[PDB]
Amino acid sequence: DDCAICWDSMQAARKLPCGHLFHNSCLRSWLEQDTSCPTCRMGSADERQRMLVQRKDELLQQARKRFLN
Amino acid sequence: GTALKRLMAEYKQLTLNPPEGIVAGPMNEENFFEWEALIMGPEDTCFEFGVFPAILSFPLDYPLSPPKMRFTCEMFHPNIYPDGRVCISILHAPSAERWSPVQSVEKILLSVVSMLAEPNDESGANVDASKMWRDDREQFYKIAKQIVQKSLGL
Ligand SMILES: O=C([O-])C(=O)[O-]
Ligand SMILES: O=C([O-])C(=O)[O-]
Ligand SMILES: [Zn+2]
Ligand SMILES: [Zn+2]
Numbered sequence A: 001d002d003c004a005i006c007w008d009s010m011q012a013a014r015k016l017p018c019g020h021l022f023h024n025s026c027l028r029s030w031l032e033q034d035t036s037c038p039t040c041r042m043g044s045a046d047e048r049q050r051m052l053v054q055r056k057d058e059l060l061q062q063a064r065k066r067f068l069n
Numbered sequence B: 001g002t003a004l005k006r007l008m009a010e011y012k013q014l015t016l017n018p019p020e021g022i023v024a025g026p027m028n029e030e031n032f033f034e035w036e037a038l039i040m041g042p043e044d045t046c047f048e049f050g051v052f053p054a055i056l057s058f059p060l061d062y063p064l065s066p067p068k069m070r071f072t073c074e075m076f077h078p079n080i081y082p083d084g085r086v087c088i089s090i091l092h093a094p095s096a097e098r099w100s101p102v103q104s105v106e107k108i109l110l111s112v113v114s115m116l117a118e119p120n121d122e123s124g125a126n127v128d129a130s131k132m133w134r135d136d137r138e139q140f141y142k143i144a145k146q147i148v149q150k151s152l153g154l
Helices: A024-031 A045-067 B002-016 B105-117 B127-134 B137-151
Strands: A013-015 A021-023 B022-026 B034-040 B051-057 B068-071
Touching: A013 A024, A021 A024, A045 B022, A045 B034, A045 B051, B002 B022, B002 B105, B022 B105, B034 B105, B051 B105, B127 B137
Parallel strands: none
Antiparallel strands: A013 A021, B022 B034, B034 B051, B051 B068
């Protein structure tokens, strides 16, 4: 099941020819979709929201200035 | 869930070092599956200083599948549908450069800022725009200019 110290999945890696490697469950999920190597071929939330909203209309404002020159 | 974990980590990473002219994140951290991205037309490109809002709608199984990306404003561009849906290789689910779990919101946006500067002439979300981009490059530059004006509200 899950590691008793940290409560994470503790699951085996599978390695592939090309070198790269991944969790067994993650790789399988992908194989289900495509038979290739996924890598090659084969703090308050409110403060964050406000920063993001403010950068959006600063981008706009600044765009207007560059356009009007 | 994997999707939500990836998305939270991409947003944090994204925010640390945002590429010039791109602001992207969830519209509300209560739902990381729905983001807005503002992209600015790079300078000295034909969509110069345009500011284009797009919505990214992420699938439950992300990053196994791409988000849908839809520009919310008006656009005239060979790789964008009438409704605003963006159609490029990286956004298509599984000889192009399709979606793999190793892509990211960031790489999607790099790709999209790229297509604004250098269209995929032979791809037909927008036939009219494709043709003109070749035959009447001169008009296309004019239509592009009024598309910028509009995105800016002017
Ligand atoms: O004890 C555990 O490992 C748990 O509850 O996940
Ligand atoms: O449990 C397993 O699958 C292992 O150890 O490889
Ligand atoms: Zn994994
Ligand atoms: Zn590989």
